[PDB]
Design a protein around this ligand. Structure first.
Ligand SMILES: NC(=O)C1=CN([C@@H]2O[C@H](COP(=O)(O)OP(=O)(O)OC[C@H]3O[C@@H](n4cnc5c(N)ncnc54)[C@H](OP(=O)(O)O)[C@@H]3O)[C@@H](O)[C@H]2O)C=CC1
Ligand SMILES: COc1cc(NCc2ccc3[nH+]c(N)nc(N)c3c2C)cc(OC)c1OC
Length: 159
């Protein structure tokens, strides 16, 4: 099984300036809950985007895609392709616009957090992948963060 998990603004924006344009602790919790104890796959840029104190992501087998051969990611496995990175029976892809798009054709689950912030898609934005008609979605209800950010959860699966 290969799962994708991400948090996006309604517009599909997941990242800008090498960072995420919001803070939603409830989403961190969700991300942590789902990926804990599993293999995670992330782009080199996601790795670099991780605050120092949560890299490698504790409690998960960290795998980082990079084309750079000298690239070292302390406490993670650096690999040069998705197919070397998808070796584990249940891998969560957590890891970058570029990487969701590579990983998409292999995935059978997605966990999406939608954050209710108006943020136009911009050139350079890391963006969420589009799920075509092969996918079946379950949409959760809007909630309010302790921080007043409205957000909701979607779960997607397919044959
Ligand atoms: N809201 C959320 O859920 C998401 C938030 N984000 C945000 O997304 C952004 C990062 O995403 P993005 O900018 O798209 O970068 P990515 O995380 O998708 O990683 C891009 C890097 O991954 C490597 N990679 C790309 N595809 C391949 C391939 N086919 N073979 C070998 N290596 C490959 C390259 O590494 P290299 O250049 O070293 O060769 C490339 O530079 C950041 O802003 C981050 O904060 C991060 C994850 C989750
Ligand atoms: C800037 O501060 C932080 C930034 C990040 N970025 C990576 C990150 C953040 C939210 C996420 N939310 C979902 N639904 N899925 C993901 N794939 C995801 C990822 C991959 C992760 C952190 O901890 C996990 C953190 O501090 C705790």
């Amino acid at each position: 099984m290969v799962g994708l998990i991400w948090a996006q603004a309604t517009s599909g924006v997941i990242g800008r300036g090498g960072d995420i344009p919001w803070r939603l602790p409830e989403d961190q919790a969700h991300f942590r809950e789902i990926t804990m104890g599993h293999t995670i796959v992330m782009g080199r840029r996601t790795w670099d985007s991780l605050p120092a104190k949560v890299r490698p992501l504790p409690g998960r087998r960290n795998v980082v895609l990079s084309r750079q051969a000298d690239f070292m990611a302390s406490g993670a496995e650096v690999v040069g392709s998705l197919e070397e990175a998808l070796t584990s029976p249940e891998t969560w892809v957590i890891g970058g616009g570029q990487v969701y798009a590579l990983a998409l054709p292999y995935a059978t689950r997605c966990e999406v957090t939608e954050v209710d912030i108006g943020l136009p898609r911009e050139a350079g934005d890391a963006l969420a992948p589009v799920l075509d008609e092969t996918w079946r979605g379950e949409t959760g209800e809007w909630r309010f963060s302790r921080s007043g950010l409205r957000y909701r959860l979607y779960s997607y699966h397919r044959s």
